[PDB]
């Protein structure tokens, strides 16, 4: 299986520096081109740089030349992007991809992407509050419950239910940016009304930028 | 640099329809054009390369063609899982450049939302803020109007909405609206109500609670 895995994305101040890695497996980067491509609200999908690790030839987008450098270590089957003099407009998901692998003249494998946030704001971990099921969240014999993940920065935060075992009926809403500059989101799940009180429901929240991991049990309220 | 112009920006069609999306290069790119799919929360996935060749594992209902500098991606029988954004990309000259994308949505029958409301949690109330959440579950089409009322006074400027992308199996949407108050303001009023207008409902639906009720 061909795989590319980016790492190193995170919050960085304007003018600061960050280094991304792209670990390849299932093929040798000596046989392909390796590209970095980013994706942002402002510019969409935007090619950043490429390298041919066999001969070290590199090319760069005009908007990053001099500030970013691409490189590869064939002995670790890994490519890198050094990012200096960072600007707000560099905020993006950074993907690495291969081109020419198996003779296919397109980017046929892309990593999951790593988010880079260029901002002067500080990291903040979220508060996790239950959205308890009640007489106001049930109808037709099913009930909705959830978790409110409030006031964090930067993205990303992840939410699962019952350690990933509960996936059916889950809606994890897209994050919203509050006027405070902090993000918030809710995750809800619909379940049988008859399971409330017998089946445990826990939302597993992870905000890696703050090393915040919260497992919150959600149950009906007392009275 | 070469510009890639995609059209339409949005296309909405029923399951089983044939859909066509287009991409124009600002100058000759020969056949050096690929098409990518991006599903919700995913990375771009290669569909077509060299204008017309199907990438391994991609369903046969995807096809591509070229006419001069005009490129087409066709899905012959739209499936619910084809709900995604689609991007063309030229690799004829450096920099490789991407189109701005076409969003493909699934048309389906109207479905009214299930409407639910959640008071602020006692945990949150221990702090100084109150979040009230209105939930609209599994509806279609996407258009919906959610209004908040506190002691019957229409609220404005103190709520935010978030909407899921189309569900991969049933093609519905869900929406949350969150009303944010100070704890002091929340404890000053009694009746919290979310009113929902949607094409599937014969008239607007109000879901509410009195602060303090179990």
């Amino acid at each position: 299986e061909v795989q590319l895995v980016e790492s190193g994305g995170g919050l960085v101040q304007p003018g600061g520096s960050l280094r991304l890695s792209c670990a390849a497996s299932g093929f040798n980067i000596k046989d392909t081109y390796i590209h970095w491509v980013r994706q942002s609200p402002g510019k969409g999908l935007e090619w950043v740089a490429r390298i041919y690790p066999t001969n070290g030839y590199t090319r760069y987008a005009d908007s990053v030349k001099g500030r970013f450098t691409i490189s590869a270590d064939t002995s670790k089957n890994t490519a890198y992007l050094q990012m200096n003099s960072l600007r707000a407009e560099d905020t993006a998901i950074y993907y690495c991809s291969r081109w020419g692998g198996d003779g296919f003249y397109a980017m046929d494998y892309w990593g999951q992407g790593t988010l880079v946030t260029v901002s002067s704001a500080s990291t903040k971990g979220p508060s996790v509050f239950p959205l308890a099921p009640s007489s106001k969240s049930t109808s037709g014999g099913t009930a909705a419950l959830g978790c409110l993940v409030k006031d964090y920065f930067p993205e990303p935060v992840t939410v699962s239910w019952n350690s990933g075992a509960l996936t059916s009926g889950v809606h994890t809403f897209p994050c919203v940016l509050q006027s405070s500059g902090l993000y918030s989101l809710s995750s809800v799940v619909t379940v049988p009304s008859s399971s409330l009180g017998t089946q445990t429901y826990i939302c597993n929240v992870n905000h890696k930028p703050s090393n915040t991991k919260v497992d919150k049990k959600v149950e009906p309220k007392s009275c | 640099d070469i510009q890639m112009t995609q059209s339409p920006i949005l296309l909405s069609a029923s399951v089983g329809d044939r859909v066509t999306i287009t991409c124009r290069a600002s100058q000759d790119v020969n056949t050096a054009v690929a098409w990518y799919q991006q599903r919700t929360n995913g990375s771009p996935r290669l569909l077509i390369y060299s204008a017309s060749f199907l990438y391994s594992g991609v369903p046969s209902r995807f096809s591509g063609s070229r006419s001069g500098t005009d490129f087409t991606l066709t899905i012959s029988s739209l499936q619910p899982e084809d709900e995604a954004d689609y991007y063309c990309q030229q690799h004829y000259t450096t920099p490789p450049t991407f189109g701005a994308g076409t969003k493909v949505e699934i048309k389906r029958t109207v479905a009214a939302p299930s409407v639910f409301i959640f008071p602020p949690s006692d945990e949150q109330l221990k702090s100084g803020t109150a979040s009230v959440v209105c939930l609209l579950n599994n509806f279609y089409p996407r258009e919906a109007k959610v209004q908040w009322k506190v002691d019957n006074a229409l609220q404005s400027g103190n709520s935010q909405e978030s909407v899921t992308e189309q569900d991969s199996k049933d093609s519905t949407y869900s929406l949350s609206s969150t009303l944010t108050l100070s704890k002091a303001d929340y404890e000053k009023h009694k009746v919290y109500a979310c009113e929902v207008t949607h094409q599937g409902l014969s008239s607007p639906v109000t879901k509410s609670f009195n602060r303090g009720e179990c």
Binding site: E155, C175 | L10, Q38, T40, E165
Partner: peptide
């Protein structure tokens, strides 16, 4: 329509 991080989808 522009790209949105939390969905990785184009948004109007």
């Amino acid at each position: 329509s522009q790209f949105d991080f939390c969905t990785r989808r184009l948004q109007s």
